[PDB]
Amino acid sequence: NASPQPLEQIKQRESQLSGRVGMIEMDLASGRTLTAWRADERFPMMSTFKVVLCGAVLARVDAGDEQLERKIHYRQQDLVDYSPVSEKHLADGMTVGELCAAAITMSDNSAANLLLATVGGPAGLTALLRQIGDNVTRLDRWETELNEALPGDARDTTTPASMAATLRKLLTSQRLSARSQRQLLQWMVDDRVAGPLIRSVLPAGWFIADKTGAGERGARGIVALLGPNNKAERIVVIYLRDTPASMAERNQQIAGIGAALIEHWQR
Numbered sequence: 001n002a003s004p005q006p007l008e009q010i011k012q013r014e015s016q017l018s019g020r021v022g023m024i025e026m027d028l029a030s031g032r033t034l035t036a037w038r039a040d041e042r043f044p045m046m047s048t049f050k051v052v053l054c055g056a057v058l059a060r061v062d063a064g065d066e067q068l069e070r071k072i073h074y075r076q077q078d079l080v081d082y083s084p085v086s087e088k089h090l091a092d093g094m095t096v097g098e099l100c101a102a103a104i105t106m107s108d109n110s111a112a113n114l115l116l117a118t119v120g121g122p123a124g125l126t127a128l129l130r131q132i133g134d135n136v137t138r139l140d141r142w143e144t145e146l147n148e149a150l151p152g153d154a155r156d157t158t159t160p161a162s163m164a165a166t167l168r169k170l171l172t173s174q175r176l177s178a179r180s181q182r183q184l185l186q187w188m189v190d191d192r193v194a195g196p197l198i199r200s201v202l203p204a205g206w207f208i209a210d211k212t213g214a215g216e217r218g219a220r221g222i223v224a225l226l227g228p229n230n231k232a233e234r235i236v237v238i239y240l241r242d243t244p245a246s247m248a249e250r251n252q253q254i255a256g257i258g259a260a261l262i263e264h265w266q267r
Contacts, residue, residue: 026237048221053116123140167235197212197222201256218241218243
């Protein structure tokens, strides 16, 4: 039998999680909203901010002010929790491009801090968001304090609608070069830490590019571009907050919301 429409499922899932779910499904070409639930409410970004960060770095590459080959060395003391790539390169350092790849594909936290140093820190990245017309998203702290997710705290938050609009700007507007957009999208295609989320329900032959996040008090989320016939057609942003659910349940609830959108794709 056909499953219920996505909004019916999402309302049910939010009840099961005993928290808030926020999501949007956006047409990539037009920016039209196709599905929305709490899409104007704030949610902690967690590591989903790393797509915006790498976009800001690639804009500096486009301007000739950054080089992906530039080498950065760092200290044991610079390493924050969950740095699976950067903790292996104390002796040899990492290039800016390797740091971007680690930040997106492995969600490496220290890599993101080393890149934040180049774009004016959290305040600088927020100023770049304001420059592209995102008046909502805000980064306030560095890794890992930005994951604190205190209830109601607007620091380090986005809304599903703002994040989707910003991803569309970064990946398809003139704000990044064609080469930079291809590279940002490829890092997201090559995400290695998102298997249990939308990828777990994605039919064969579909395009996927994504970035996950996790934070305190149950915070969890994904940003994704996906579509049939190996072409990106829609942006899907799903955030959870203030839930006591296990990581396994949070992953499967996000996957289930994705499955509902995929099964009801055609309008």
